Amino acid sequence: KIRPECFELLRVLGKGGYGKVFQVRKVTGANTGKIFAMKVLKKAMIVRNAKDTAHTKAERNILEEVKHPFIVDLIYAFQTGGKLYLILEYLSGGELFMQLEREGIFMEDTACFYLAEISMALGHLHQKGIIYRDLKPENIMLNHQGHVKLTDFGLCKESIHDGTVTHTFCGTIEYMAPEILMRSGHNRAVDWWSLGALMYDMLTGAPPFTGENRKKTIDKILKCKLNLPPYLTQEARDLLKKLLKRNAASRLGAGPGDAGEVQAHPFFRHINWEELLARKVEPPFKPLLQS
Ligand SMILES: CCc1cncnc1N1CCN(Cc2nc3cc(C(F)(F)F)ccc3[nH]2)CC1
Ligand SMILES: [Zn+2]
């Protein structure tokens, strides 16, 4: 019978308006001593909002259904009279964002590795009719070995909440597709845009469309006049041009082949997809080894 007293609170990993994420230690039952991450959501801050209650139920359902090496695992889920609990696998490798901050710019082979693993998580989700929608570096974590882990499937993590309509404008919009920003309707092609923005950020040190303020940034994304730096490889530039297109339906990955279309691009010519999925490829960075 899984209950809050089954877990010892160790430390706070994140604090938002909707609740906290803890590192926890299981203290009862078979797994005694096992370390997990625990997300604790404030019911009363959710129960009033309609789209927030829906999103809370969706995260629960997605994570329980999905089993994939590059997507964070849900272990337990339970409720009390005021809190929702999610017990997820503890991931010790930090955020992808931290590795990018350390390095400034990734070498092509480094970027290629992360983008390739991401393309597989993305492909798996699309098979199940799930859309990720924001591939900003802070949404991607690394496991203890340094392999990719997609992890934001639930409520906005912020404390302030830009307006009270949606949660699009609460964090950075620098990796979101134009059609998300316009709310004109969208589909899985949004994830391939976003993979392109993350790629551009990895290879140049900054996202493709950044302005002084939020309005100028939005305007740059909608205009979608891509500036390809001339020192990227021919392969990297060709993939970026194909991912970062205003017209969603013409992006690489947007057709019937989905991840298959992106994976067949020459930028990924040195990737063995069976060995990658099996995690037999050594990551460029091993967080346990880092200082
Ligand atoms: C649970 C997956 C994970 C696994 N292992 C180690 N670290 C992890 N995370 C992944 C998520 N990450 C960012 C974060 N998400 C948040 C969600 C909230 C919410 F309560 F929903 F509002 C609050 C603060 C939050 N901070 C914190 C550490
Ligand atoms: Zn928000």
241 alpha carbon to ligand 2 midpoint, in Å? 31
- To test the pocket of ligand 1, the residue of 84, 157, 159 to mutate (highest count of ligand atoms within 8 Å of its CB) is 157
Cα 164 to Cα 2: distance, rounded to the nearest angstrom: 34
How many CB atoms are located within 10 Å of the residue 227 CB?
A: 9
Q: Which residues does 245 contact at the CB level (< 8 Å), separation at least 6? A: 193, 224, 251
Ligand 1 mutation pick, 15, 20, 21, max ligand atoms within 8 A of CB: 21
Ligand in closest contact with the CA of 88: 1
Residues surrounding ion ligand 2 at CB below 5 Å: 156, 158, 161, 167, 170
Active-site annotation holds for 109: no
Compute how many other C-beta atoms are within 10 angstroms of the C-beta atom of residue 94: 15
On whether the CB atoms of residues 14 and 157 are closer than 8 A, the answer is yes
How far, CA to CA in Å, does 260 sit from each of 24, 63, 111, 122, 223? 38, 23, 18, 11, 28
Question: Using a 6 Å cutoff on CB, does residue 286 contact ligand 1?
Answer: no
Q: Which long-range contacts (CB under 8 A, 24 or more apart) does 161-164 make?
A: 161/17
Could you give the CA distance from residue 49 to residue 163 in angstroms, rounded to a whole number? Answer: 13
Distance (Å, whole) CA 85 – CA 20: 10
Query: Nearest residue CA, atom 13 of ligand 1?
Result: 14
Beta bridge partners of 41: 19, 84
CATH number, domain 95-291: 1.10.510.10
Ligand 1 atom with the shortest distance to the CA of 88? 1
Domain ranges of the chain: 1-94, 95-291
Quick one: tokens of 22? 């803890």
To the question of whether residue 13 is assigned a binding role by annotation, the answer is yes
Experiment type: X-ray
Q: Are 119 and 263 in contact (CB under 8 A)?
A: yes
Helices (H), the chain: 50-65, 96-103, 108-127, 178-182, 189-204, 214-223, 234-243, 259-263, 273-277
**Is 196 flagged in the annotation as binding?**
no
- 157: CA distance to ligand 1 center in Å? 7
d(CA 191, CA 262): 11
Q: Burial, 129: exposed, middle or buried (Cβ in 10 Å; 0-12, 13-18, 19+)?
A: exposed
Listed residue (148, 107, 121) closest to 270, CA to CA: 107
Query: Is 34 a known ligand-binding residue?
Result: no
Catalytic residue among 52, 73, 134, 162: 134
d(CA 203, CA 86): 35
Sequence-distant (≥ 6) Cβ neighbours of residue 67 within 8 angstroms:
73
Do the Cβ atoms of 150 and 126 come closer than 8 Å? no
> What is the architecture of the domain spanning 1-94?
2-Layer Sandwich (3.30)
Resolution (A): 2.1
Q: Separation of 216 CA from ligand 2 center, angstroms?
A: 21
Burial label for 116, CB within 10 Å (0-12, 13-18, 19+), is buried
